Amino acid sequence: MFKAVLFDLDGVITDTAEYHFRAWKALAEEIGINGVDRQFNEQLKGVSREDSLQKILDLADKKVSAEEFKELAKRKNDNYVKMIQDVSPADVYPGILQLLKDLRSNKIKIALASASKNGPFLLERMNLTGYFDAIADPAEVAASKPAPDIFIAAAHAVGVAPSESIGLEDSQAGIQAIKDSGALPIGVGRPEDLGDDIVIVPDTSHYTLEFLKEVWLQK
Ligand SMILES: [Mg+2]
């Protein structure tokens, strides 16, 4: 049987995407650039703060100083950090709390493998800290998803090999990272997005200890 479950945060435990979008739209409004809508925002997911700001500046072909660029990026993040002050246990996705309770009682390690620089803060605010045996520090990983580094780090931090672990993710990049770590991915979402070759559930209410055990045995 598997020995650990490696969780991403956004799209698995809770939603951070909505707050990122609001922080970028607020910032875009302040400097008078139109076109930062949820459709545009798809081009911001999975990219660096700097690269996302550059994409928003390209909308208006706006140039800034290196100093102003750094300030705008910082403002966006300060805005983001203010908005996530609202996060509570009410924002934990369906099934996730009960899953973490069952894993813990069954002595299965729990690690976060998130690029969130606020993962620890966000787990405290949702009252989940007590379930996690490790959080992989994204500032200490050389390469982002779809590179496996952060899933490897999360597994090593709880004393297992990725080969002994299940990884939970909703993103193409995330599923590819889990697969290349040697962990077994279980996707949440749509086969059209995440591939036909892995087990996928429509939503997190299906991520149960019993379902995870069935998947591991079946391959
Ligand atoms: Mg995700």
3-state secondary structure the chain: CCCEEEECCECCCECCHHHHHHHHHHHHHHCCCCCCCHHHHCCCCCCCHHHHHHHHHHHCCCCCCHHHHHHHHHHHHHHHHHHHHHCCHHHCCCCHHHHHHHHHHCCCEEEECCCCCCHHHHHHHCCCHHHCCEECCHHHCCCCCCCCHHHHHHHHHCCCCHHHEEEEECCHHHHHHHHHHCCEEEEECCHHHHCCCCEEECCHHHCCHHHHHHHHHHC
Whether residue 144 contacts residue 153, with contact meaning beta carbons closer than 8 Å, is answered with no
Q: What are phi and psi of 136, to 5 degrees?
A: -65, 125
CA of 207 to the centre of ligand 1 (A): 14
Whether residue 9 contacts residue 2, with contact meaning beta carbons closer than 8 Å, is answered with no
| Cβ count within 10 A of residue 60 | 13
CA of 197 to the centre of ligand 1 (A): 18
Q: How far apart are CA 25 and CA 4, in angstroms?
A: 38
CA of 31 to the centre of ligand 1 (A): 30
Residue ranges with CB less than 5 Å from ion ligand 1 = 8, 10-11, 170-171
Q: Which residues of 126-141 are buried (b: 16+ CB within 10 A; e: fewer)?
A: bebeebbbbbbebeeb
Catalytic residue among 8, 133, 197, 203: 8
Q: How far apart are CA 38 and CA 187, in angstroms?
A: 23
Q: ∠ CA(46), CA(202), CA(195), 5° rounding?
A: 55
Q: Using omega within 30 degrees of 0 as the cis cutoff, is the peptide bond preceding 148 cis?
A: no
Quickly tell me which residue has 């019993």 as its tokens: 210
Q: How far apart are CA 181 and CA 126, in angstroms?
A: 28
Q: What are phi and psi of 64, to 5 degrees?
A: -140, 160
Residue 180 is among the residues annotated as catalytic for this protein: no
CA of 71 to the centre of ligand 1 (A): 28
CA of 146 to the centre of ligand 1 (A): 11
**Method used to solve the structure:** X-ray
- CATH topology classification for 16-85: DNA polymerase; domain 1 (1.10.150)
What residues are designated binding site for Mg(2+)?
8, 10, 170
Residue 58 is among the residues annotated as catalytic for this protein: no
Nearest to 15 by CA among 87, 74, 73: 87
Q: ∠ CA(172), CA(177), CA(179), 5° rounding?
A: 95
Q: How far apart are CA 47 and CA 179, in angstroms?
A: 21
Nearest to 162 by CA among 187, 138, 181, 143: 181
Contacts of 194 (CB under 8 A, 6+ apart): 170, 172, 175, 187, 200
Tokens of 159: 């004393």
Q: How far apart are CA 2 and CA 183, in angstroms?
A: 10
| C-alpha neighbours within 13 Å on the C-beta side of residue 185 | 28
What residues are designated binding site for beta-D-glucose 6-phosphate?
10, 46-47, 49, 116-118
Whether residue 12 contacts residue 201, with contact meaning beta carbons closer than 8 Å, is answered with no
Residue 88 vs residues 25, 83, 122, 131: alpha-carbon distances, Å? 23, 12, 8, 16
